[PDB]
Write a structure and sequence with these properties.
1 helix; 2 chains; Spike protein S2' (chain B); part of a larger assembly; elongated; little secondary structure
């Protein structure tokens, strides 16, 4: 879904969670959180609309 | 003929000017109403250009 955090994109997060403008001027940064945020037995704490 | 030629040339210039509306020019369709009614603005911008 990081691929959807870009201008002109579509999908659940882009349409209903975080929408970037057509003429965005800036940067999008992302990195692997699997060690910190994911807990043994599944991490179900983060929600998306 | 010298009087008919000017009216014919202007009529032909207007006819070709209008016929240039029936031309794709690299767009998916000639009628801009169809691109604005069928394509998302992020791509309707490029199809209109």
């Amino acid at each position: 879904e990081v691929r959807q955090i870009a201008p002109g994109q579509t999908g659940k997060i882009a349409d209903y969670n975080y929408k970037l403008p057509d003429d965005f001027t800036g940067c999008v940064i992302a990195w692997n959180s699997n060690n910190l945020d994911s807990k043994v037995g599944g991490n179900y704490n983060y929600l998306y609309r | 003929g010298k009087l008919q030629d000017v009216v014919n040339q202007n009529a032909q210039a207007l006819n070709t000017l209008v016929k240039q509306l029936s031309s794709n020019f690299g767009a998916i369709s000639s009628v801009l109403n169809d691109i604005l009614s069928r394509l998302d603005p992020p791509e309707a911008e490029v199809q209109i250009d």
